[PDB]
Amino acid sequence: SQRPTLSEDVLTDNRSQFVIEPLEPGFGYTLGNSLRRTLLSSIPGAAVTSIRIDGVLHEFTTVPGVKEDVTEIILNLKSLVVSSEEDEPVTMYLRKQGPGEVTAGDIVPPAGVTVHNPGMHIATLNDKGKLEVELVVERGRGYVPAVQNRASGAEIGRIPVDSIYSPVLKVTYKVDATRVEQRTDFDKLILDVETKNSISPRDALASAGKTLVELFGLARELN
Amino acid sequence: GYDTPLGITNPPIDELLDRVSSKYALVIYAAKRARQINDYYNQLGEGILEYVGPLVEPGLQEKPLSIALREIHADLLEHTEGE
């Protein structure tokens, strides 16, 4: 018996399960492996490419009135989660003077750039020091070495950063089979997706489905 | 009967060794002819053309030595063993 195959959705706020059935026997692990492999490597996202601390010339130094050094600040900024709508590099700002911790939700983004965990810890400020930064946000996929700022040849004040624009986090699956002797033999795949709060699970699964329909659109053709 | 050879392994070394007398001879044999095919490209513009050009058809950006071994395999050349 031939039935088309459709996928159910199970909800949880940041990570959802899906249920695809029925499938050809043995075919469950490979299908789920494909969706997983696409998910972990190929969804478009955005991240911070180059930052600019005022009063700093390079990464290997410190600022007056900060508790951490510049490398520490960069290492906090690698955990920012930033969603952008425009297609070209956009600039954000961060100014905080006096006593107090400075957190991720202090950035003044432009129109169309959101910061999804505005309670993340950046740095701590002593009474003596005042921090002022400008960041550049470009949108890519996968992972990108920082050096790509250096061959551009920008000014001295600019620091490259590493960029990880991947918005998925943890993808898994489990295959529930039926092995009876009658014709009722089919595979049931159950996927599981968990994203970084920059895009929803159904959304990432959508982008990966698109990718794969494109890559099979050239390879299903008659020879 | 074997898989098709690739890269530096083509042409098979057995069929090469079949033409030549001994393993060492195939080396001098090849290197002289490859020296010639290297010379032909500089005698060609101007001067005495006593050396004959690459005999079997030379693919693009092929080294002289490769052309050489390629045509030893075709039985295009003959050698006189040393004295």
């Binding site: - | 060492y24 080396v27 001098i28 002289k32 295009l76 050349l77 006189t80 063993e81 040393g82 004295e83």
Partner: protein, 62 residues
């Protein structure tokens, strides 16, 4: 004498050599390396090093 002079007692060996006016041939790898001339084994011996190669007469160019 050329091989002997490299192991030990250079002056002694050379003296006996030079009185005798003896001539050593160059069979052997040690001697041949010392002069710097091609070593007489493998692709160094004279029945390989002196080969001629013609394109076969049957091969008639276009």
């Amino acid at each position: 004498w050329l091989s002997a002079a490299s192991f030990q007692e250079t002056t002694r060996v050379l003296t006996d050599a030079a009185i005798n006016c003896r001539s050593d041939k160059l069979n052997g790898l040690k001697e041949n390396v010392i002069i710097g001339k091609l070593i007489p084994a493998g692709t160094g011996i004279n029945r390989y090093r002196n080969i001629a190669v013609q394109p076969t007469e049957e091969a008639r160019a276009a």
